[PDB]
């Protein structure tokens, strides 16, 4: 497998026996999540289960709107 040689003249060492895996290109894939367009959160419900559902739906709505607000800024790394 792996072997190593030390050169005293130049104070250096070389470790041989490795195999390559070089990133030479890029493959791009599109990952999608299907979303639901909801507007009517109307519910005259005081049940705690109803309140939990309302909280989780608000979280979903906030996530979607936050992603949209991110989308109004085009992607760029620097």
């Amino acid at each position: 497998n792996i072997t190593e040689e030390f050169y005293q003249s130049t104070c250096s060492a070389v470790s041989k026996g490795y195999l390559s895996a070089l990133r030479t290109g890029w493959y791009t894939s599109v990952i999608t999540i299907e979303l639901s367009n909801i507007k009517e959160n109307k519910c005259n419900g005081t049940d705690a289960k109803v309140k939990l559902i309302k909280q989780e739906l608000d979280k979903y709505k906030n996530a979607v709107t936050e992603l949209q607000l991110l989308m109004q800024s085009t992607p760029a790394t620097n």
């Binding site: 493959y27 999608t32 979903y60």
Partner: protein
């Protein structure tokens, strides 16, 4: 480190191009229709590129089908704590994806498991248009694949949230690679500042590629899995195969080996794959130690090496290093330190990014200046001085001035 000689690429240029293509009219509708009866399909975009497409989560189906059939006759109170928990489980992945993109400005790396789970990534690898060798390599090293991947958020429209995952393509596989470790090579004088030092600057990873050698100076961007080395060519320099000649003979004329020069003699160690290089200078106490025997070697001044068999610890000054315990065979190649060959008087001692030939040229120039001055100084000695200024003529008899009156 030769990292300043590297180029400047654009990592997510290809992914951003796919995002821009996805914003064209009808592109999102094409993807939505394609992902109607399946979670995975191949879609040809308007620019002629065929890209794999995944639907990893369907919140539209779970909210409209299950949930939201609550008969809101002022009540809406149709619920079961199970579907509350189930909705939290489904919605959490969207929340985590939104969290990650919020703190990374829409581009993330490595691709997290929320962005792409292991099963989805393995399925993606299986259907990629690559060799079975490349599929096997990516599947066996999923964690490295994640580390060399970007997730770029494209678009959220038409009830579709889409982001591109930009995966690596390993077009060079199973070619031999080797790693070069370098340590400073000074003279062994005990006094401070009275030493000349030299160091090879070409340390890093080397791999054979298309009849050349791809050289990765910043070895911290290369990930090693046992005997395999994963490297990015965007962080590489392409060199002729003769760069390996610097390991058999640093003075070979077929390749100009890279070195740097200094007058600072400082002790340090370099932990290699199967051993340790120790550069001991001045009055530093450098030792090699064993966990069951204690100190078993005391290094002398200069550059030395010890293998990992029988040695578990190297101490250089107040710094203690653990050596790697990887199995393998080590070989010591004896030779005279090349720093002995250099005259310190004409030695260029601040060559930060230099080479063997460049240092030799500067030494030649300094010696040429010395010879030129000596030749002028010697030629001047062959001339004659001024005869005494005393109002009487003088003649040159042998090497001195004698009065003309003596010969009249």
């Amino acid at each position: 480190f030769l990292g300043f000689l590297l180029g400047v690429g654009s990592a997510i240029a290809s992914g951003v191009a796919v995002c821009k293509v996805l914003h064209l009219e009808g592109e999102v509708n094409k993807i939505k229709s394609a992902l109607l009866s399946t979670n995975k399909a191949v879609v040809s975009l308007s620019n002629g590129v065929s890209v794999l497409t995944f639907k990893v989560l369907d919140l539209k189906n779970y909210i409209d089908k299950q949930l939201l059939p609550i008969l809101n006759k002022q009540s809406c109170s149709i619920s079961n704590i199970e579907t509350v928990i189930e909705f939290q489980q489904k919605n959490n992945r969207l929340l985590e994806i939104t969290r990650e993109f919020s703190v990374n400005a829409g581009v993330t790396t490595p691709v997290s498991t929320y962005m792409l789970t292991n099963s989805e990534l393995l399925s993606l690898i299986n259907d990629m248009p690559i060799t079975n060798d490349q599929k096997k390599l990516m599947s066996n090293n999923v964690q490295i694949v994640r580390q060399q991947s970007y997730s770029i958020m494209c678009i959220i429209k038409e009830e579709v949230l889409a982001y591109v995952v930009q995966l690596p393509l390993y077009g060079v596989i199973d070619t031999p690679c080797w790693k070069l470790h370098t340590s400073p090579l000074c003279t062994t004088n005990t006094k401070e500042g009275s030493n000349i030092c030299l160091t090879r600057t070409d340390r890093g990873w080397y791999c054979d590629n298309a009849g050349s050698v791809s050289f990765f100076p910043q070895a911290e961007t290369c990930k090693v899995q046992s005997n395999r080395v994963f490297c990015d060519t965007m962080n590489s320099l392409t060199l002729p195969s003769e760069v390996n000649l610097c390991n058999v003979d640093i003075f070979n004329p077929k390749y100009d080996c890279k070195i740097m020069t200094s007058k600072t003699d400082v002790s340090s160690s370099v932990i290699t794959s199967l051993g340790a290089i120790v550069s001991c200078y001045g009055k530093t106490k450098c030792t090699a130690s064993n966990k069951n025997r204690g100190i078993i070697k005391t290094f002398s001044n200069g550059c030395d090496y010890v293998s990992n068999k029988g040695v578990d610890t190297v101490s250089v000054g107040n710094t203690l290093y653990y050596v790697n315990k990887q199995e393998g065979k080590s070989l010591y190649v004896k030779g005279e330190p090349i720093i002995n060959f250099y005259d310190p008087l004409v030695f260029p001692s601040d060559e930060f990014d230099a080479s063997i030939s460049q240092v030799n040229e500067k030494i030649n120039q300094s010696l040429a200046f010395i010879r030129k001055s000596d030749e002028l100084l010697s030629a001047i000695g062959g001339y004659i001085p001024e005869a005494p200024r005393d109002g009487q003529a003088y003649v040159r008899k042998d090497g001195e001035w004698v009065l003309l009156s003596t010969f009249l």
